[PDB]
Structure 1
């Protein structure tokens, strides 16, 4: 319905399959040549995007005001093409949601929509030994959720999937100011 209508339009215009030396990831293009990935993707000086070799001009791993990892990496891509600007769909404050859909898009898991249900505030989380901040939690019973993913609700882009414990998954919450 309307939730999936938004998620589908986001996929088409803003969610891309990428590959780094760390594997296959879902990338969210935010605007212009600016995109975001889970930090564990560890993008290098070049990246594969939809089967094309793209230079990475800048890569910034985001931290909070204490320097705590947010598990998000902002990259600026060496390209002429521009992403549709979706920042107006990213909330000003990290937001929970009901009936959320996780959009995964990698070469091995293309154009995949996963209903995760309610996304709830969690906060500080030790993610595979790395203290992380500003996380949210949802049901996601897989041990292989290590490809990123875009968490959406009706007309809102609320998180980037960063991992899980085999029962629940967790996302790094998105705020509009990250992309200002």
Structure 2
């Protein structure tokens, strides 16, 4: 890819991603709008994080759950920083769905911003990730790696999820739904 799907992803990286550092390492963070970022819950962000190496206070944070209290592996952070993110909420789906031909946009743990074609994505339900029940997963068949967490699953004009785990054959993202942010 050097065409539109790659190009949309690179723009998404440049305008709406950052590297979030916690005590658990470096994660790709998705800036949703203004000072709101999402990161995988297992990043366990505290009261201070780094955003692109800059120590930043977390004004508030909260984890998301499904209807039965199962973690979604999404954590929302409101950051104490001057910069505002471009609002990408209109690109986030309203509903769960399957999606053909998706890409993953990676920033953290890569030598340079990286776009990967993960192929077709299905809404997979609940899984066990490192032994923990996790809900509203999107599954793709791609050999993801340890440094991919927080990577943004997308298609042109559609911001679909954030990468939270895998087993070497399959990769999983937490679904982004517009109602989480509105």
- What is the TM-score of this pair, normalised by structure 1? 0.95
Note the alpha carbon deviations across 1:48-95, whole angstroms, 9 max, x for none.
111211101111010012111100000000012100000000011123
Alpha-carbon distance in 1 for matches of 2:121, 2:19: 24
Alignment equivalent of 1:88, drawn from 84, 87, 90: 90
Structure 1 residue matching 2:149: 3-state secondary structure: coil
- Residues 1-150 of structure 1 correspond to what in structure 2 (within 5 A)? 1-145=3-147, 147-150=149-152
Alpha-carbon distance in 2 for matches of 1:95, 1:51: 35
Gaps of 5+ in 1: none
* Greater alpha carbon shift after TM alignment, 138-147 vs 86-95: 138-147
Q: CA shift at 1:142, angstroms?
A: 3.7
Task: Number of aligned residue pairs: give it.
Answer: 180
Q: RMSD of the alignment, in Å?
A: 1.3
Alpha-carbon distance in 1 for matches of 2:109, 2:145: 19
Structure 1 residue matching 2:10: 3-state secondary structure: helix
Q: CA shift at 1:96, angstroms?
A: 2.4
Q: CA shift at 1:125, angstroms?
A: 0.6
Gaps of 5+ in 2: none
